[PDB]
Amino acid sequence: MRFTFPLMAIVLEIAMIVLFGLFVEYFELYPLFQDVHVMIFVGFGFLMTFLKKYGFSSVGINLLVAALGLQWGTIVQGILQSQGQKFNIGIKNMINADFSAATVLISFGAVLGKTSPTQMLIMTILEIVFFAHNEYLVSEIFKASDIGASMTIHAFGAYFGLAVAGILYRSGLRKGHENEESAYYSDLFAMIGTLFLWMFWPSFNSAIAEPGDKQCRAIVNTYFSLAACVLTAFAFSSLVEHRGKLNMVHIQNATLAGGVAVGTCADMAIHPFGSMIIGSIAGMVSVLGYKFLTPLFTTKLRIHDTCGVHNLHGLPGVVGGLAGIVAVAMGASNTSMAMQAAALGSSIGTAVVGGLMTGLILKLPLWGQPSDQNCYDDSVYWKVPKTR
Amino acid sequence: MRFTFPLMAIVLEIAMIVLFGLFVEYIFFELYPLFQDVHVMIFVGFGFLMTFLKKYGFSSVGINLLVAALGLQWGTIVQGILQSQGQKFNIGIKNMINADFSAATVLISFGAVLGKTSPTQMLIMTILEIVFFAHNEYLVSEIFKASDIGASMTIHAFGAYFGLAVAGILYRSGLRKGHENEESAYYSDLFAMIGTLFLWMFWPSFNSAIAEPGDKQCRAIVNTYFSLAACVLTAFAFSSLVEHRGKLNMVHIQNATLAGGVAVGTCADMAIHPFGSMIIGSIAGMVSVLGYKFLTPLFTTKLRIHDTCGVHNLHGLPGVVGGLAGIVAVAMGASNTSMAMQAAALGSSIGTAVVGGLMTGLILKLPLWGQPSDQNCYDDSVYWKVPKTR
Amino acid sequence: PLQQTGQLFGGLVRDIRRRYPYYLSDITDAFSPQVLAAVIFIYFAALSPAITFGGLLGEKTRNQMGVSELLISTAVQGILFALLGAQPLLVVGFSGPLLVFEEAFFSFCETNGLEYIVGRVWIGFWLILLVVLVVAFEGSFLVRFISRYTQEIFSFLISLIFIYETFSKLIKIFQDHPLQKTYNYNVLMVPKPQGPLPNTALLSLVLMAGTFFFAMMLRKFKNSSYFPGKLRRVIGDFGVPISILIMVLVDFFIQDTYTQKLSVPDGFKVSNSSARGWVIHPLGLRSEFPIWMMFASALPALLVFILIFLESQITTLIVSKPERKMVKGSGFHLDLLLVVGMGGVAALFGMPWLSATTVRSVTHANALTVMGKAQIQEVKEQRISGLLVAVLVGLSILMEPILSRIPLAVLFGIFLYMGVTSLSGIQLFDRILLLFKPPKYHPDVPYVKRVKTWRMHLFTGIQIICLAVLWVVKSTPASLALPFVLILTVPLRRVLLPLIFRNVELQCLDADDAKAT
Amino acid sequence: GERVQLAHHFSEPEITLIIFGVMAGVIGTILLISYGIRRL
Amino acid sequence: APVVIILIILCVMAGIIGTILLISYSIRRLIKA
Ligand SMILES: *[C@@H]1O[C@H](CO)[C@@H](O[C@@H]2O[C@H](CO)[C@@H](O)[C@H](O)[C@H]2NC(C)=O)[C@H](O)[C@H]1NC(C)=O
């Protein structure tokens, strides 16, 4: 049925309107919110536009998924905070809504090109619930320090997408696809999203930090972590390719691993040299992952990651969680170390379980999945112009 | 003849310099964050949103930049003169946010006559339309004392119907059936998505810049945020509904997703509740998609009014919906001020837009400004040195 | 459509297979101003009977079922029927025979000391059993034995009842405020005037006359030769809304004179909160419900089933004649099942069961009827009109400030227009007019040119005797036997009439497709 | 409900489910009897 | 309790979508044959 997507979108919008009527009531953090907003809707949106025949779907489904996600995440996170009571909408609620949208977009990066918009709406709805429950658990039960959300956002979304793609495994696409190839101007467009993410990541890691020392420490640590990560990503991208060539996938993605891996330790007093070391290790790990672990996952473990979001969010997210554990062990934080370990493990496990359940739901042949031949093609769901 | 464009531009710039010397003399570091976002909206979102044409990207973005740059100098002059009543006035942050709102109105009007006008015609249209817009908005804000903080009436509807009037006067019989250059390309649509996303993200600052600090500004931000959120979902749903085989159309995603922000402008600062803002956004998105599907062909083929960007379906119809929503919100006790003044503001905005657009199009229709032929419409090569390679 | 398949639920699926393929057309066909004018017409045409019958039911049952319950039931059943029925042009709502049954059942419960609403719940429970069996065995195949004879008799009788009640309301208005030389200027107005008031009945008569006159004038202007054709037809489709607006403004500009207005409930609440709630326990609210009444409710359930079945099926026959250009199909089995099931469900909620009323459905079909350049061209067969009517009836409570300024006299003129326009599709009415015409002026139709004049006049006179008897039945306390007396004409047509009429005369005079035998 | 009502062993959902089950059983019995008839 | 409310909302949305899809599939299978 071709009417599944508009019907589902209208029903979801009506449900959001009813929930905002039932549960929702009525400024120095606004520029940081705008920076996070620009990240969510431009950086992730254009970062996935590297495919030559899937730019329309990537950017449009990014916008649609994040627009549904901010409302649904607002409702779910507010309900979890207020124990089922009404709550006021401030700037922090909008920031956390954009964070939930970020998690859903990170998951969407894994199954890009092999899913329908209807599947994306369903995955958004389920993933927001799972992510918000995990985030509430980490923030209020374990009370870990994850101000940059290496474990609760990046690792969670990465492993959620990995589980969804593992359930949604296609045997015909395991050896590659003719449409799964980048273009010149498509990579040029992806650099826009890469640059915007890199420029505004300190606000991502310092939006909801405690005002004062912690916020400044988060800003400075994120900035220097990214500065080191860029150089190390370039170096290792040259190292792992033939004749020292630079691979555009590495420059587009791995340059952002420093922000992910410094997220847990952002507000800690790890010093700029420590942040630079973390960013360097993150860039090295991301490049090594893209070079070697992604084909290993695709061919042997039967888990296809379209954008390689594992190498950008999961491995740097786990690195950031372990860095938080070490930094607590070194006295850089007054949190519990066992709580940081529990937060990392619980984030990974909840992501895997929720991804398995959501992928099992999405495998039902009702949502208009593309055929194996038509994967990574805009013409399945969009009116594509005749010329490029 | 050949020097008309630079000569007119230098004369206008010298006039602006003289007027600034005559009338203009020199909280700010608080609203500056929001000004930066409006400037990014005015100079990037509108600039690239209209670059969807496959052979008109250069003229789109460059004439957008030129028009907005001259507008921020002319709108400052005219609005400061109107507020100060002919006396010298000092320029602060609010003075340069209103000058970017006048530029926004002129760019909305540009969206209607895109691809069929010369840069000289755009200079003339900017100069006249800023005067008409400033007088209408002074009337609405001070005589009628209507609440139009997001300017669904003074900016969006005004610019949309101004551009419709200008396109009606500048009607070309050869372009009624269509043109070979009036179609999109893949990467041109990606640039249009760049512009769309920037407008969509920075619209809350656009609506809440002039709002009273405190509760009203926060209400404006929240209402715009959730109205746009609802508008995206409904625009996607109805774009899938109205198109053939359920295929999404990029024009709908590029334009109709901003209709929620357009329509919530009048009710931005009011206590219309987030559910009310989401309802307004959903209705605006549905109306915009339906307009793009049905009414624009009716406007082009039957009413002899061609709308290149479909700025009617994005700014006028959602703008009129926003005016009606403001009237209803005043009725439902959501704010102060009378219903009659909101209705008078909407009517005066539409009427002044139509009359000023008629006069401006009559001045533009003169065979003096080097307007292109019917063959060369939507082609960059008429005014720009286009590279051989794409 | 009336054939017996022999398969269990065969007629149900056949009706499902007939109309549901046209579902996308049922939404797209409604994007026209004529559908909107039909919605505006049928909104009043279904709300005013709903309000009046809810008031009467609350008065006669001590507000155990009232205006709000009737409005809610009407909205729910109309939405479900427009979204699922195979004849969406039918209008679902309360009717007179249902009110008579409610009065009789309330009297029976009061005499025997039984709980009226719990007995209603049990009767509605018994209704679901009856209609499932009838649809399963294709009990709707017996409708094929109702010819144009019974259909036209029932339609003419129902139109006469509607017009007579419309005039009797005006008679009641005149009697309540008679024309007197002097009046008491100090009369209490809440809840109703306690004495005669000056200028009330005469202004109501003026409003009713103006409404009917302007409705007829704009209907004639639809078929006239004035103005451009598009604007002329747009105005003609909106003749009823324009007449209503003109007369409402006329009454609004007169402030001193009192006129009775529409009254709606204050909010979505039960009429009597001290008696029952929204959900009624089938085991009893105040006292334990007797076991014997659970089984004894079958006979009243049978009577209600007969009433609803005959009413809805004859209405479906009338609104879906081949001569009315209904080229999308109708579902006899599905719609009957849906109507009786929704009635049984609404009985569980303390709400009245509903059936397809003839007058409102025929007006709704005629509102969407497109006349060619005379000759019926097509019908805007779509589901949006009935759904919108149901939604507006449900929302009538929330729009009290608008409905409180509409006089009943304008609605009376609208009812008169509906009654006089409901007689168009009846050949019995046409033959009645031929009783006062010279034989040479009679039209060139098969039933006149092939049958002798006195034979046709005798055939018409026999039907009038049946009409007069049915009028006697209505004006007697045994008015619940009316469907049986109407059924008794089926033996009259198929047994007694052939003894005095030839086969050719019967074929010409009673033709399903108006053919010359 | 409303005001004071007598308390029964079965609640309203329970009693309506029991009644619906009895009705479904009766309908199934009638359908099976009809299926048996017109075959032998 | 917030978890109960969120699960209830998910159950309502899933039930609505499932019922609509079930009705559509039943109508399709009755209509095609
Ligand atoms: C609501 O219902 C109650 C009880 O069902 C009605 O109260 C009865 O009123 C009649 C009329 O005088 C008398 O039998 C008694 O006064 C009451 N009987 C009982 C058993 O309470 C009440 O009148 C109803 N309300 C309305 C507005 O009709």
Ligand SMILES: CC(C)CCC[C@@H](C)[C@H]1CC[C@H]2[C@@H]3CC=C4C[C@@H](O)CC[C@]4(C)[C@H]3CC[C@]12C
């Ligand atoms: C035709 C429809 C209404 C079903 C047929 C009704 C008969 C056969 C059934 C349906 C529900 C049944 C009742 C259900 C529950 C009870 C409570 C118990 O303590 C005594 C018997 C009693 C009171 C039953 C009597 C018989 C009953 C009334």
